[PDB]
Amino acid sequence: SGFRKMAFPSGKVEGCMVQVTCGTTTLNGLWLDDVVYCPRHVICTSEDMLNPNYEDLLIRKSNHNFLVQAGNVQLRVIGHSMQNCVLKLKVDTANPKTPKYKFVRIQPGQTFSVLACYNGSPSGVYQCAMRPNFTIKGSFLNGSCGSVGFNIDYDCVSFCYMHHMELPTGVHAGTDLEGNFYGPFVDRQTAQAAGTDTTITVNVLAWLYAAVINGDRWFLNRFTTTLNDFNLVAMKYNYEPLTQDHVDILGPLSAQTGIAVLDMCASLKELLQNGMNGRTILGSALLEDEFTPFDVVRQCSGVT
Amino acid sequence: SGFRKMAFPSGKVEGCMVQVTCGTTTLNGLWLDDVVYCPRHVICTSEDMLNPNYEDLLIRKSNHNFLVQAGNVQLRVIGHSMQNCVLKLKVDTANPKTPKYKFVRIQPGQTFSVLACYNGSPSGVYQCAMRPNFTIKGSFLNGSCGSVGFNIDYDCVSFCYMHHMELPTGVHAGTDLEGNFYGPFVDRQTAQAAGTDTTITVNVLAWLYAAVINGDRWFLNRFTTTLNDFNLVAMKYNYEPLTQDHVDILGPLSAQTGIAVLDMCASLKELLQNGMNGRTILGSALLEDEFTPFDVVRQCSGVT
Numbered sequence: 018s019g020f021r022k023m024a025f026p027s028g029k030v031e032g033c034m035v036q037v038t039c040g041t042t043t044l045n046g047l048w049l050d051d052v053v054y055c056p057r058h059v060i061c062t063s064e065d066m067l068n069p070n071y072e073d074l075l076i077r078k079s080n081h082n083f084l085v086q087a088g089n090v091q092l093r094v095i096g097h098s099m100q101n102c103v104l105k106l107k108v109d110t111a112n113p114k115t116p117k118y119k120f121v122r123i124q125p126g127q128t129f130s131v132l133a134c135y136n137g138s139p140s141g142v143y144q145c146a147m148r149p150n151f152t153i154k155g156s157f158l159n160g161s162c163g164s165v166g167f168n169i170d171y172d173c174v175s176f177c178y179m180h181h182m183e184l185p186t187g188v189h190a191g192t193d194l195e196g197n198f199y200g201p202f203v204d205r206q207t208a209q210a211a212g213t214d215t216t217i218t219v220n221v222l223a224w225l226y227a228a229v230i231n232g233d234r235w236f237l238n239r240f241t242t243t244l245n246d247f248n249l250v251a252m253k254y255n256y257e258p259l260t261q262d263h264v265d266i267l268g269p270l271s272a273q274t275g276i277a278v279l280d281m282c283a284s285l286k287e288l289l290q291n292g293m294n295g296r297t298i299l300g301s302a303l304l305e306d307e308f309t310p311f312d313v314v315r316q317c318s319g320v321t
Numbered sequence: 322s323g324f325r326k327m328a329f330p331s332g333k334v335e336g337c338m339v340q341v342t343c344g345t346t347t348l349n350g351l352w353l354d355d356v357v358y359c360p361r362h363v364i365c366t367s368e369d370m371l372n373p374n375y376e377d378l379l380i381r382k383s384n385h386n387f388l389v390q391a392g393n394v395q396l397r398v399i400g401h402s403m404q405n406c407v408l409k410l411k412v413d414t415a416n417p418k419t420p421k422y423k424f425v426r427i428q429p430g431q432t433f434s435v436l437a438c439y440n441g442s443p444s445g446v447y448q449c450a451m452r453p454n455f456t457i458k459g460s461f462l463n464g465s466c467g468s469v470g471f472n473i474d475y476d477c478v479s480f481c482y483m484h485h486m487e488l489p490t491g492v493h494a495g496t497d498l499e500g501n502f503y504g505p506f507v508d509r510q511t512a513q514a515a516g517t518d519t520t521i522t523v524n525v526l527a528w529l530y531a532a533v534i535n536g537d538r539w540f541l542n543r544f545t546t547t548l549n550d551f552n553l554v555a556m557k558y559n560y561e562p563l564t565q566d567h568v569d570i571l572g573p574l575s576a577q578t579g580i581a582v583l584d585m586c587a588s589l590k591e592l593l594q595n596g597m598n599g600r601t602i603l604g605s606a607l608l609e610d611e612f613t614p615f616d617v618v619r620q621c622s623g624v625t
C-alpha cells in the first residue's frame with residue numbers, strides 16, 4: 018500500500034552521463050555505444066544565444082574543440098555532426114556501461130523519469146509528465162542542459178527527452194534523442210509561447226483508481242455519467258476530452274476495482290464541480306495528473 | 322527553476338541489491354563488502370508472524386538454508402547472525418560494486434530516498450521523510466521488505482533505513498542498518514499504535530523559502546511574529562514547535578531571500594489560519610513538509 022511519485026531506478030542512465038565542454042560552455046552529454054549526444058547550444062556564446070546561426074557556429078568547431086569527460090577520463094572525439102538540435106560526437110571508445118536502449122518520441126500526457134545532471138554528474142531523479150502543450154515542469158538550474166528523460170522496461174532504457182532550456186515562464190523545453198523539439202520551441206533565447214495547457218484526464222482517472230486501490234474512497238459517489246456529459250465538464254475545467262481509447266486503457270483498472278470507467282468519470286465530475294472540501298486524496302489536495310494508467314498498474318503490481 | 326520531490330540517483334544502491342530466500346519466503350538483501358543485510362522475518366512462516374520467537378526460528382536454520390542471489394549469480398553463505406531485527410549473512414565474496422558507505426540513524430523530520438525492490442530487483446525510487454512518529458508513508462507491496470533508504474554525499478552512501486513492514490493503518494515501519502526499529506514498532510503481525518504525528522515545521526518553512534526562490538510569493542505578507550506566538554499556532558495545527566536550532570538551520574535560506582525567519586513564520590501562520598483559498602504553492606494545494614532546509618539548498622544550488 019501507499020502511492021508515490023516514483024521514478025525509475027537511474028543506474029543504467031548514470032553510467033551514460035558525461036560532461037561536454039566547447040569553448041566556455043559546459044553541459045551534459047549521453048554516451049551510448051561510440052556516440053555522445055548533447056544539445057547543440059553547447060557551441061554558443063552569450064552574444065549568440067539571442068539568435069544563433071548553428072550551421073555557422075559549428076563550422077568554426079573541430080573534433081578537438083569538444084572536450085568530453087566521463088568522470089575522470091577523457092574521450093577522444095573522432096567525428097561531429099548536428100542532427101536537428103542535437104550534436105552527435107563520435108568517440109573512439111564504446112561506453113562499456115551502455116545498457117540496452119531505444120530512442121523514442123513520447124506522446125503528450127505520457128510520463129518519464131529525469132536524471133538531473135551537472136558537469137556530467139547525476140544530482141537527482143524525479144518523475145514527471147510531458148504536458149499536453151509539450152513542456153515539462155521540471156527542476157533544472159544552470160548547467161542542467163543535456164540531462165535526459167527515460168522509461169525502463171525490463172533491461173531496456175527508452176530515452177525520450179533531452180533538456181535544452183527554460184522558457185521565461187519557468188517551464189522546461191527539450192528534444193527527443195534525434196534533436197527534434199517537443200512542441201513549437203526553438204533553441205533561441207527569445208519569448209516563446211507555450212500554448213494553453215490542459216489537465217491529463219486519463220491520468221487523473223488512473224490516479225483515482227490508485228486512490229481506491231489504496232483505501233482513499235471518500236470521493237466515490239452514487240452517480241454515473243456519459244462521455245458526452247463528462248466532456249462538457251472537462252471542457253469547462255480545461256481537462257483533455259476523454260475518448261473511448263482512454264476508456265479502453267483504463268479497462269484493467271476498471272476490472273481490478275470493479276468501478277466502471279463512466280462511474281469514476283462521475284466521481285471526477287463531482288470533484289471538478291465541488292472541489293475537495295478541504296480533504297485529500299493520496300496525500301494530495303489537488304487532482305494529480307502525472308500518473309498514467311500504466312504507471313498505476315506498475316506501482317500497484319510491483320513490476321521490476 | 323522549478324521544484325520537485327527529487328530522489329538521489331539510485332545507481333550506487335542498485336549494485337548492492339540481492340534476493341534472499343529462506344524456506345518459502347523471499348525478500349531483498351543489501352550486499353556490502355562480504356555481508357548481506359536483510360530483515361530477520363525472512364525466517365518466518367505465516368503461522369509464525371503472529372508472535373515469532375526469532376531466536377528459536379534462527380536455530381533451525383543453517384548457512385545453506387539462506388539462498389542469496391545477486392542477479393543471476395549465487396552467493397555462498399559462510400556465516401549467519403542476528404543483530405536486533407536484521408540478519409547478517411556473511412558471504413565468501415565481497416560485492417565488487419560496494420560503494421563508499423556509512424550506516425546512519427536518521428532523526429525524525431529528516432528525508433531520504435527509498436529504492437523499492439522486489440526479488441532483489443529495483444523497481445523504483447522515491448523521496449520521503451521519516452515522520453515525527455517514526456513511520457514512513459511509503460509505497461511498498463508484498464516482497465518489498467529489505468528495500469533500503471539512503472542519502473548520498475559526494476561518493477558516500479549513508480544507509481539509514483531498511484523496510485520491514487506495513488502497519489494495519491497502511492503506513493510503513495523499518496529499522497536502521499543495525500536492525501533497530503525506528504519508533505516503538507516490533508516485527509510481529511499485531512496491532513501497533515503509531516502515535517500522534519505532527520507536521521515538520523522546519524521543512525514547511527524551508528519549502529516556503531523554495532517557493533519564494535522559484536517565484537511563488539503570493540503568500541508573503543506584511544506581518545511578523547515571535548517564536549512564542551508562532552508556537553501557539555503550531556500547537557493548534559499539530560505542527561512541531563519551532564526552536565532556535567530550527568531558525569539557525571533556516572539561516573542560509575533567510576540570507577538568500579532576505580526574508581527573516583520570523584517573517585516567514587508569520588506567512589505560515591496566516592496560511593495555517595486561512596488556508597490556501599484555492600491557490601497553490603510549487604504545484605501543491607497543501608503545505609509540504611518532505612523537504613529539509615538542506616534539501617532546498619541542494620536542489621536550488623545543483624549539488625551532484
Ligand SMILES: COc1ccccc1OCCNC(=O)c1cc(=O)[nH]c2cc(F)ccc12
Nearest residue numbers: 058157158159160161182183204205206322
Ligand atoms: C534562455 O536560455 C536558452 C534558450 C535556448 C537554448 C538554450 C538556453 O540556455 C542554455 C543554458 N540554460 C541553462 O543552463 C538553464 C536551463 C534550465 O532549465 N534552467 C536554468 C536556470 C537558470 F537559472 C539558469 C540557466 C538554466
Ligand SMILES: COc1ccccc1OCCNC(=O)c1cc(=O)[nH]c2cc(F)ccc12
Nearest residue numbers: 018362461462463464465486487508509510
Ligand atoms: C504484517 O506483516 C508483517 C509484520 C511484521 C513483520 C513482517 C510482516 O510482513 C512481512 C511481509 N510484508 C510485506 O511483504 C509487505 C510490506 C509492505 O510494506 N507492504 C505490503 C503490502 C501487501 F499488500 C502485502 C505485503 C506487504
